[PDB]
Design a protein around this nucleic acid. Sequence first.
RNA 1: AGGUGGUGGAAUUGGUAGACACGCUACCGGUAGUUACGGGUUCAAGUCCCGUCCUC
RNA 2: AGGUGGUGGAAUUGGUAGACACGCUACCGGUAGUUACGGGUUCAAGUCCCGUCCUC
Lengths: 259, 259
Amino acid sequence: PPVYKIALGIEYDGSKYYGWQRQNEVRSVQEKLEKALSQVANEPITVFCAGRTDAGVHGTGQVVHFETTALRKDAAWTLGVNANLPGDIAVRWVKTVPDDFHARFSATARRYRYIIYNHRLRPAVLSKGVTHFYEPLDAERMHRAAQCLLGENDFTSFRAVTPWRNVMHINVTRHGPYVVVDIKANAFVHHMVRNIVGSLMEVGAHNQPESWIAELLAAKDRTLAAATAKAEGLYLVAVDYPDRYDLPKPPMGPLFLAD
Amino acid sequence: PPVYKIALGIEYDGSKYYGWQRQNEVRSVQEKLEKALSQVANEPITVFCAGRTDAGVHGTGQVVHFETTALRKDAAWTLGVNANLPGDIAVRWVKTVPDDFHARFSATARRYRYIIYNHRLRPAVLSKGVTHFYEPLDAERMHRAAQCLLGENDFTSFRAVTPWRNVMHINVTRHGPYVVVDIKANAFVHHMVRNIVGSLMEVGAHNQPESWIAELLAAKDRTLAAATAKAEGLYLVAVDYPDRYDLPKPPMGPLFLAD
RNA sequence: AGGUGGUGGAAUUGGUAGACACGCUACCGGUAGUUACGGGUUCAAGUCCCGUCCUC
RNA sequence: AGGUGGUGGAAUUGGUAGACACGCUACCGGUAGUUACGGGUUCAAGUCCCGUCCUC
Ligand SMILES: [K+]
Ligand SMILES: [K+]
Ligand SMILES: [K+]
Ligand SMILES: [K+]
């Protein structure tokens, strides 16, 4: 028998499942995906995702892979799949990927995106999927201050307690009344991202200094900075890989929000 | 007793209710809004909305009004309300509006917005709320051809069978992989909007002539043009009013999608 | 000057209260389990008045 | 050349089938109610093969 390895770019609005990973009781993405996906090969399939993203967390670039003895025409895998998939999980693309690949492992670096309302007045354009902030923010600052964590420092101050991850780019802008964050750090420590935002969103609305970003970073402490950033607003928009593999990689959303 | 009239800009993701208007059995916006809203004055309230928008139809500018003998500090009306409101209905603003006002009636002209995916691959960034199209579209055209219904003609060709409504602006663009439509016609005939899109979306993917827009318009027939446009993708982003009244009017979404 | 779940610690500074972190018991990363009292005003009270009983 | 709910009329041209329109019975704008047959291949068949029985 020939086992075929193929990773696929899946896309999923969180909001309603309890995160990625399984565990007999409730319901997860993987659960959903695993099942459907495997139903289409009669050989019970198990997926290997590249970012065990948890509850109320969205993805639009999450990519997974797996092996099988079954064979398709790139269709069951694309069109097929999300057909047996609940309208909040989709496939985006597929690729006959070389055995030496790994999703979690071949991975080289990630990129998340944080969204936020600001009207002072909870949105209705779907709750779960944005988190809105009250008191008025300041982009110029948000981004202004954050832009220095790219150094590389001890993020031990943002790990919910190797605290040496490498940041490549920060970026905090206000496309509309929303403010949008994005980062492409080599790797990530627990939440972080999230504890970053809070501890950055704080600076946004003032209440804290502009320079303060460098304080707690250097300070090197979690039990100092701002509260972890809600949840319903994270967007894993794509994980970076090597070009040997050559994945298909399209617009990372989460919506019009251009790459 | 002094009855107070006040209209308020409400915002609502459709998707899950069965439209605006009530009727003992199921569940509607108005139902939701009516209730909550009225709970906050102990005088059973009835709303008067300015666009009885139906099932799976979104609003982000829908505005309603009503009268009451109760009195507030602009808070129960804003913050209060959507607190007693399900996360898919929000208030956006309120205004102590002059008795001579009317929501449906004082209205002068409307503006809808249509969204669409195009990946060939159903999105997961919430279904209900977008409708995605298969075969690849053409904005340059979409908008190119539509731009002539602003004349005013017999739309009797788009009324699901006075078929003389006045169009002020059409507009069909591709902010991202989405294509986005918007129109500000004085008034509207049954669906229309919707039957327009289909009969315009057709031109988008070809299958029909570029000039064809003027054909059926002049043709003056419904049982000729393309199928009515899905549903889960309409966005009543604001209704235009007179400046005597002076409403507060903020960004019309539906998201970052800038005014 | 105040008092919130097994603690710390918050509440668009009248609005689904317990966010966010944290601790031990289970159980195949989860899910379960282990607003001081009495009134009052208001459409609503952790937050506002009258009180009893606490507290550095 | 084909055959789909009370009809017309479609199905990312193997994928939750009945979209979109339309007709009469109720009932305080709604909600209810009034894939030709037998097999086969495939993980899946309105759509693909073998068939019976229809059809301009
Ligand atoms: K206040
Ligand atoms: K045991
Ligand atoms: K095909
Ligand atoms: K009767």
